[PDB]
């Protein structure tokens, strides 16, 4: 682990350069706490370790869901491994629920007003005059060049809109824990290699408010030591008992709260290049996936028997039903399980027109849903494990994101062409 | 005409009461200037009468538009009939180009940014601390109650989308005369008897900024009285030459600058009811709309005479066909025109299906389109002659407003049933 010369050195960490790695460098944490721009500053054993955990298993949350991260790996108790990036000296703030510096610039809103969607703000960093809020117009008048990407227009909209899916994501990951994730500061950087603007400094106990049970009075993050009178070292203990309570439960954010299944039941092996399709698509929101060959037409007492294998284990199931022409696999499945059933047929322009009625009109007491498209059908299944998996959900989030910022990508290229 | 008790009275206006009119109120000008919350304050002779010719004229033209607003008419030269409001204490900016006070707030931010859309700022109404910018949130929390009406997100979401509404119409509605709207001030009441929040106050020159051919330097407002380093009688001469160059030119925004036509084509008098509703609907816009019978198939000699005759008078032309069955007159009159020309086919569900073809697919060399609803058909003529007249945009986008405003109320009833 070849360490270079010192890059940047801040209040909380330091980054060096690696000179085995190109592009890569490692920010190592300090066992320093700081906050406001006087003399609030304290050394505080074990917080490197405690702030590297938290930004690490974070990170990976984060990059497992689909956001653009600046992280390579941990690399030690108090260190972490990154790609290179040049930062946007903005901090990205997103509120659920209003308190703080949001109070102070909007008198007469009270402790506790819900943001929906979830509100965003810029502060520009300048500790000399106490980092004031910007508006996007500020921003953009900036013309602010780094690793040679202008940010416009189309850059602020990205991290303006990844700021709210990166909140959403902490926000639902914290849930099962009974923690309110009431707001955040975060900021980006532009990959010196890629060009990409990616999430990147860290996210610890300093980046966010995190109220157990939404209590504030049994709030776990920094806010514990900005609002001490006086730092005594019978403080600072609270303080650090505060960080470790979060260190102690991060790791668990990682964790699946709830199995998952797709069960792909297919008339015919014919089928089998369409089912292939749902199974690796299913594949990219992290959730297991069976192929079965069953005919409710020719073997309907094998299609009963092979649903109660599925139906009997505890396994959360959807059962995704395959089957082209006359389509009676779906509607014998959802009238015989208390489980969603999607027929997602395999239809072709030659008799699809024809073929699509028998899975959309049913009998009465048939649930079964049709969904044409075969990476849909399992995008529709992940939405459903969604409401009872954080990972799931973390997934489909990000994918919102990343499809609306590859649109805003092919704008910027296809306006080209209109100069 | 008799006067009331003195009900409110301001810097350059003052509200009186009509016995003889319940619910009505007199809005008198006053030959006064201000500006700030200091001692820059003038008598100015004609000054009245600009202001209630302005706010006369300008009220007219948005509630013509469609534009809900406390104006019933003027009353003499210097005052105007309104219905009573009560009025909610907040100034509505709306800007299309930054200068003014959004530069000192966003410092970075260069004169002549655009806002695409157009930006809508909040200040509360106090002359004591200058008219401070509120948040939407700081309004809301605000719990502010007039003539009944509790003002919360409806409200809010209501008075912010027509103040971008109206601020559109008026920059449309300046174009033709070369004036650019740079930003304007409004202030919107609840109407004592109806109860539905409308545009109120007034909008004089006091309310705008008006640059003719977009130069600052050109300026015609009150900015030009602002901007005096020292009120001399020389520097209030001009002051006064600004407003009545506005004032001499405002009555020009109620006038058509384009004729504007459509002709309904019909095969058989038994689709006259279809035809009647187009006819209607183009009333709505203030569009002059024709009924004719011609037959492409029985009497093609003679459509093609009737197309001359509305091709030759130089009047701007809408043609819609209006044919059941194998519509051939649309594509006939395409093919024959360089107007434009639509199909308002009257489908019925009996055959609409077969049809509707006859429309759509077209040979080469024809722009033909199709509109099925005759009321559709009406509003994409009206779109037609919007781009060459402020009048009829005025319409459509006072109607986009005023069908969003609809559904705002729509789900606040429904959200009741909820609870
Ligand atoms: N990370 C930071 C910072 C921050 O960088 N603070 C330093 C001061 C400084 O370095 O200048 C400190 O006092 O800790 N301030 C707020 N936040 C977070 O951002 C969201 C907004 O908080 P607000 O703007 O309401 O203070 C909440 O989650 C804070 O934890
Ligand atoms: N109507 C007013 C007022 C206003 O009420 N002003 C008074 C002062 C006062 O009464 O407190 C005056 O100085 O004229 N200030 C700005 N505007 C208009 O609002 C938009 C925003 O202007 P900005 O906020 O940039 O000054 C532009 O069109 C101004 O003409
Ligand atoms: N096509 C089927 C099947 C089946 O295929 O098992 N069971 C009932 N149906 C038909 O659906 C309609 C609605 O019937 P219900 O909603 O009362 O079951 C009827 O015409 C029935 O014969
Ligand atoms: N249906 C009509 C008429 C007409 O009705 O006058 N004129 C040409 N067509 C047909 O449209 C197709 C496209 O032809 P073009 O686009 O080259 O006119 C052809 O098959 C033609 O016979």
């Given at each position: 682990?070849?360490?270079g010369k010192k890059l940047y050195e801040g209040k909380t960490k330091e980054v060096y350069e690696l000179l085995?790695?190109?592009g890569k460098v490692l920010l190592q944490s300090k066992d320093q706490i700081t906050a406001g721009n006087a003399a609030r500053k304290n050394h505080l054993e074990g917080k490197?370790?405690?702030?590297?955990?938290?930004?690490?298993?974070?990170?990976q949350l984060l990059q497992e869901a689909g956001i653009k991260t600046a992280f390579t790996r941990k690399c030690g108790e108090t260190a972490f491994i990154a790609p290179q990036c040049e930062m946007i000296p903005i901090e990205w703030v997103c509120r659920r629920i209003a308190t703080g510096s949001?109070?102070?610039?909007?008198?007469?809103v009270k402790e506790g007003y819900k943001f929906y969607p979830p509100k965003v703000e810029l502060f520009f960093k300048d500790d000399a005059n106490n980092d004031p809020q910007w508006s996007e117009e500020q921003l953009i008048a900036a013309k602010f060049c780094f690793a040679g990407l202008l940010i416009g227009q189309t850059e602020?909209?990205?991290?303006?809109?990844a700021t709210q899916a990166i909140f959403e994501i902490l926000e639902k990951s914290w849930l099962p824990q009974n923690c309110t994730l009431v707001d955040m500061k975060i900021e980006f950087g532009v990959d010196v290699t890629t060009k990409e603007i990616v999430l990147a400094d860290v996210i610890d106990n300093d980046s966010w408010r995190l109220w157990p049970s939404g209590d504030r009075s049994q709030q776990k993050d920094k806010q514990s030591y900005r609002d001490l009178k006086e730092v005594t070292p019978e403080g600072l203990q609270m303080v650090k008992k505060n960080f470790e309570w979060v260190a102690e439960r991060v790791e668990l954010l990682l964790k699946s709260e709830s199995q998952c299944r797709?069960?792909?039941?297919?008339?015919?092996?014919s089928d089998l290049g369409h089912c292939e399709k749902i199974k690796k698509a299913c594949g990219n929101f992290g959730i297991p996936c069976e192929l079965r060959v069953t005919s409710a037409h020719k073997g309907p007492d094998e299609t009963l028997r092979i649903k109660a294998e599925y139906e009997g284990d505890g396994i959360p199931t959807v059962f995704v039903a395959?089957?082209?022409?006359?389509?009676?696999?779906?509607?014998v499945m959802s009238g015989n399980t208390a489980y969603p059933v999607i027929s997602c047929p395999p239809l072709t322009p030659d008799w699809g027109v024809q073929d699509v009625w028998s899975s959309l009109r049913l009998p009465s007491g048939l649930g079964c849903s049709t969904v044409l498209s075969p990476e849909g059908s399992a995008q529709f299944?992940?939405?459903?494990?969604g409401l009872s998996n954080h990972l799931v959900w973390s997934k489909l989030r990000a994918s919102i994101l990343n499809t609306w910022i590859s649109l805003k990508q092919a704008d910027k290229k296809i306006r080209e062409c209109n100069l």
């Open positions: 682990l070849n360490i085995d790695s190109p490197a370790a405690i702030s590297n955990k938290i930004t690490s298993c974070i990170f949001f109070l102070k610039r909007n008198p007469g602020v909209d990205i991290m303006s809109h797709v069960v792909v039941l297919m008339g015919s092996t395959v089957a082209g022409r006359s389509n009676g696999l779906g509607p299944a992940a939405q459903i494990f």
